[PDB]
Design a protein around this ligand. Structure first.
Ligand code: IHP
Lengths: 132, 333, 27, 56, 96, 43, 55
């Protein structure tokens, strides 16, 4: 019931919330949005919205590396995805794309505690000061 | 149900061919062990090819690809690229199938096929197509309960001696200088010297060692520490073992049973299927670790409830207590 | 300059072996 | 009571023979006295001197 | 300005001082002793003591357990809390 | 070659790091179990 | 929990660094053996569940 499609409003508000609160507090960020939970917010951050994620075409090297690795460790996408530097869902889609296109008074009264200054080789007798 | 399995296991032993006869020096060996780390050492890449032999490649790639996910606890996140996740819904089938594979390792294909018999007329839990299929080989009864191994061996004296000679071969350590050469007096007759007490251990360790060498360490392993061995021979009347929660002893009447007697139902009579005779007795005893679990369950009731109502606790007690009693029953007394 | 201390602003308050290739191609 | 109510005499109320019970409370008091002196001493001292400020 | 307050802890206990005796190891003995000789000879004795002290026709696999002699992992002490062998054993035991 | 995570050495042998001349011994447990007196009384 | 997950992360990282422990020839031995077993057992593979499946 809570599940559904992601909205530009929810997604931008997710950007701002993640910016303000920080990465480790999910319940606080899920509190602001409606119809979405904390798990969904976190996985939605790390899966897609995260700026460190690389959204662009795959170069030739990334295709060589992806194909080789996928033939090395079949069906393991969460192991391969960090090695090529792409999202697991993304490299999946691209792979099926490659096979697809490959064929109180202490203050104010009396001076709290008083230290009269000590007296030294000079005359302080005379000195007094003006009012305000 | 598991206890009925214990019963099938006991009468399965007692129905074996000439099982208790020590006349020629026959030796029986019960061996119980675990695979130690089994779940944790399953390799995903291999598991994929193993499942491709069973089900449609899609199902296999789903099952495997599921075991590769992110484990999160509060702060921590990591990827599991190696060990299998137990908590998966279908993890059971992976466990039992992989276990089938390692079984094929332990028993060997010839013997295993002998046990499952011909696929056109498969056998039941314990029985063989023929007697000659029983006598054909040292391995007699093989029972695997999830990750636990229960094995029952029948040896003629020669086969046993061979095993002992191989273990006591490249298995010296060699070490133990004080133990190995211990001096004694050869001047006297055997009986006036180092009797036979530990000599029974040899056959046991040779068994356990032989089993272990059939399991490559990188796949799975078996630790002597967690395992247990018992041996039945003209020196040892009693045969002990542990299946599931039950600690079981077996004393034949062909050995020294002295006075034949009945007792409370804690004594099972093992009845020969052929001759309808009571050929031995199995005593049941509730295993230690079980008692420990129950005790931690009561302690769970006391500790975890400081708030809860008094009628509620009594429900907790009753539930745990019937949980023990319906299951164990006879062995409790 | 050396003893400039990066502010500890709080956030609270990978390689692979080639043996995998030999194995996988083997299987 | 067992020894006292031995014969004709029944389970009735009247047995005097305290000496024993009396002893017991006196032993109690012998020991508890110094305790109460020390505890009541402190009670009085807190009452009059004040609860010590420092909790040092 | 000394308070009449008391406390349980404070009361007399062990009012006597146990002076060391002559066989316990009074300072008199110590002053006279040649420690170095004693220390050497004890050491030598210890060293001496130490010296005195010391079918299946079908299978996948040929023997794995060939030269596998335990290894000194429990002889190594490690000053690292998560890689001490003690910690490994603890971790092994209490998690499933 | 390959080492299972069962073993996998981290850190050199205790002895090796210090060198041969020094003796390195790991005391765990103890001896002279406690009811014994360090400093034994006169009689 | 925290310790266990630590040593866990250790074991994963060491399994990636140190590569598969099963070596190779061993793994081939396993796969082959299983193949022989399922062969002599006439086991037919389990197919994918069809759209129309009465159970
Ligand atoms: O027979 P009594 O002179 O009336 O003595 C009774 C009585 O003693 P017996 O029953 O042994 O004759 C009670 O015994 P129980 O009823 O408890 O069996 C005893 O009680 P205790 O066992 O606690 O001593 C009770 O004392 P109480 O009423 O406090 O229980 C005590 O009479 P007193 O009350 O006069 O001691």
């Amino acid at each position: 019931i809570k599940g559904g499609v992601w909205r530009n409003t929810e997604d931008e508000i997710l950007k701002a919330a993640v910016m303000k609160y920080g990465k480790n507090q999910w319940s606080r960020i899920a509190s602001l949005l409606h119809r979405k939970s904390a798990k969904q917010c976190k996985a939605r951050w790390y899966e897609w919205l995260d700026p460190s994620i690389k959204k662009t075409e795959w170069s030739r090297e990334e295709e060589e590396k992806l194909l080789h690795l996928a033939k090395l460790m079949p069906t393991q996408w969460r192991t391969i995805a960090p090695i090529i530097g792409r999202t697991a869902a993304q490299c999946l889609e691209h792979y099926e794309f490659l096979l697809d296109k490959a064929a109180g008074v202490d203050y104010n009264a009396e001076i709290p505690f008083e230290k009269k200054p000590a007296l030294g080789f000079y005359d302080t007798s005379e000195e007094n000061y003006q009012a305000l | 149900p598991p206890p009925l399995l214990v019963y099938k296991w006991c009468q399965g032993i007692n129905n074996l061919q000439d099982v208790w006869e020590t006349s020629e020096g026959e030796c029986n060996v019960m061996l119980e062990s675990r695979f130690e780390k089994m779940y944790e050492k399953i390799d995903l890449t291999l598991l994929n090819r193993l499942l491709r032999l069973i089900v449609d490649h899609n199902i296999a790639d789903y099952m495997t690809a599921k075991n590769n996910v992110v484990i999160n606890y509060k702060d921590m996140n990591h990827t599991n690229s190696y060990g299998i996740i137990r908590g998966l819904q279908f993890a059971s089938f992976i466990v039992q199938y992989y276990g089938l594979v390692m079984d094929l390792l332990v028993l060997g294909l010839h013997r295993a096929s002998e046990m499952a018999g011909p696929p056109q007329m498969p056998n039941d839990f314990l029985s063989f197509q023929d007697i000659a299929t029983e006598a054909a080989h040292p391995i007699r009864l093989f029972c695997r309960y999830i990750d636990r191994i229960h094995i029952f061996f029948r040896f003629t004296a020669d086969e046993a001696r061979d095993l002992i000679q191989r273990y006591l071969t490249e298995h010296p350590d060699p070490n133990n200088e004080n133990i190995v050469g211990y001096n004694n007096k050869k001047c006297w007759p055997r009986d006036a010297r180092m009797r036979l007490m530990k000599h029974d251990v040899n056959l046991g360790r040779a068994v356990f060692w032989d089993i272990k060498n059939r399991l490559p360490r990188s796949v799975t392993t078996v630790q002597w520490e967690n395992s247990f061995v018992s041996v039945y021979s003209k020196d040892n009347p009693n045969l002990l073992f542990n299946m599931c929660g039950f600690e079981c002893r077996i004393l034949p009447k062909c050995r020294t049973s002295y006075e034949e007697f009945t007792h409370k139902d804690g004594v099972w009579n093992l009845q020969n299927e052929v001759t309808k005779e009571r050929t031995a007795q199995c005593f049941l005893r509730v295993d230690d670790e079980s008692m420990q679990r129950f005790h931690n369950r009561v302690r769970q009731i006391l500790m975890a409830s400081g708030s809860t109502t008094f009628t509620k606790i009594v429900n907790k007690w009753n539930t745990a207590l019937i949980g023990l009693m319906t299951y164990f029953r006879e062995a409790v007394v | 300059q050396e003893w400039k201390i990066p502010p500890c602003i709080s956030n609270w308050k990978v390689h692979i072996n080639e043996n995998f290739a030999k194995l996988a191609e083997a299987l | 009571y067992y020894r006292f109510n031995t014969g004709p005499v029944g389970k009735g109320p009247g047995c005097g023979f305290w000496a024993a019970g009396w002893r017991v409370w006196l032993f109690f008091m012998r020991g508890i006295t110094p305790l109460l002196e020390r505890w009541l001493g402190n009670l009085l001292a807190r009452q009059f001197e004040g609860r010590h400020s420092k909790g040092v | 300005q000394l308070s009449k307050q008391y406390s349980s802890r404070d009361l007399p206990s062990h009012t006597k001082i146990k002076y060391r005796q002559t066989t316990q190891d009074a300072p008199e003995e110590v002053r006279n002793r040649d420690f170095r000789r004693e220390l050497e000879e004890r050491e030598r004795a210890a060293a001496r003591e130490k010296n005195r002290d010391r079918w299946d026709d079908d299978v996948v696999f040929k023997n794995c357990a060939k030269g596998v002699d335990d290894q000194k992992k429990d002889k190594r002490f490690v000053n690292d809390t998560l890689r001490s062998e003690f910690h490994k054993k603890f971790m092994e035991k209490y998690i499933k | 070659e390959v080492v299972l995570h069962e073993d996998k050495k981290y850190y050199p042998t205790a002895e090796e790091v210090y060198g041969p001349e020094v003796e390195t011994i790991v005391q765990e447990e103890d001896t002279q179990p406690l009811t014994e007196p360090i400093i034994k009384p006169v009689k | 929990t925290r310790l266990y997950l630590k040593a866990e992360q250790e074991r994963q990282h060491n399994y990636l660094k140190d590569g598969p422990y099963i070596t190779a020839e061993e793994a081939v031995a396993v796969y082959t053996t299983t193949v022989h077993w399922l062969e002599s057992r006439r086991f037919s593979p389990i197919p994918f569940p069809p759209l129309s499946y009465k159970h």
